[PDB]
From a paper:
In this report we identified that aaNAT5b is a SAT enzyme in the yellow fever mosquito Ae. aegypti. Although aaNAT5b recombinant protein displayed SAT activity to all tested substrates, spermine and agmatine are much better substrates than others. Although aaNAT5b shares only 8% sequence identity with human SAT, they have similar biochemical function, i.e. both acetylate spermine. Structurally, they both have motifs A and B, which are characteristics of N-acyltransferase superfamily proteins and an acetyl-CoA binding sequence folding similar for the cofactor binding.
In an effort to investigate the structure-function relationship of mosquito SAT enzyme and the substrate selectivity, efforts were made to crystallize its native enzyme and to soak them with its substrates or substrate analogues to determine its complex structure. After extensive optimizations, X-ray diffraction data was collected from the crystal of aaNAT5b soaked with hydrazine. The overall architecture of the structure is the same as in our previous report, with RMSD values of 0.1 to 0.5 Å between chains. However, a disulphide bond between residue 183 and residue 213 was found in the structure and it links two β strands (β7 and β6). In addition, residues 1–5 were modeled in the new complex structure, whereas they were not modeled in the previously reported structure because of the poor electron density in the region. All the test molecules are docked in the active center. Spermine interacts with Asp166, Val129, His130, Ser52, Asp48, Tyr28, Glu32 and Thr168 by hydrongen bonding and Tyr29, Phe51, Ile34, Trp101, Leu108, Val129, Ile131, Leu132, Gly165, Phe167, and Ser172 with hydrophobic interactions. Agmatine, spermidine, histamine, hexamethylenediamine, and putrescine share similar binding residues with spimine, but the enzyme has less interacting residues with them. Human SAT forms a dimer and the mosquito SAT is a monomer; mosquito SAT has a disulphide bond, and human SAT does not; and the conformation around the substrate binding sites is different between mosquito (two helixes) and human (one β strand), which may explain the substrate specificity of the individual enzymes.
Author numbering: 1 to 217
Amino acid sequence: MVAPESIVLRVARLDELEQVREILHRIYYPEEGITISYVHGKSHTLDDERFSLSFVEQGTVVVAEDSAAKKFIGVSIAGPIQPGDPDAMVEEAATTETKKWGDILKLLALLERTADVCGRYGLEKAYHVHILAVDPTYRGHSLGQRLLQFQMDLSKKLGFKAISGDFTSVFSVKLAEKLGMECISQLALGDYRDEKGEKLFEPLDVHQVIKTCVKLL
């Protein structure tokens, strides 16, 4: 229902912080398998949001915009990862505002440690897509692929040698593979236990497996 060249992909500017916040609220957090599988509340927290938004000033937040409608219709958030990150995430978890964000941090740390992208390929760091979300209303415009391809092209231009992500739905994994990413590690979300032996995520079968997938750039 929209002219296809009315769709613009670009880096979000710092001054657009609030519109990034808005798209994350509307189309990302309500559908993210990790977030919504959590057994003590499905909504996201402020410390989760603060993390996502910290990347806007770094210039690695990519938006899809309907320029006619002057509206964000897609978003992807990425950042560097490097050895040492998982331990630092666990440390932040001990002091963060919510138990939920602390619990998710520890999950993400496990995903990152297990994947070991930097170790596996001999890198000092890699580019990791934290978030990839598309407004369902704008299906049929290949937005997911375009957002991911944009992050690939961008990180390559910034001198990163690998891009990764944790792909938490069967669709997002298929997209990743389509663009040449190989899934090198995985985790059954239902089977994840923290260091207290507790089961903190209870997913629908659509979000049953999380695959970390990587592509050399």
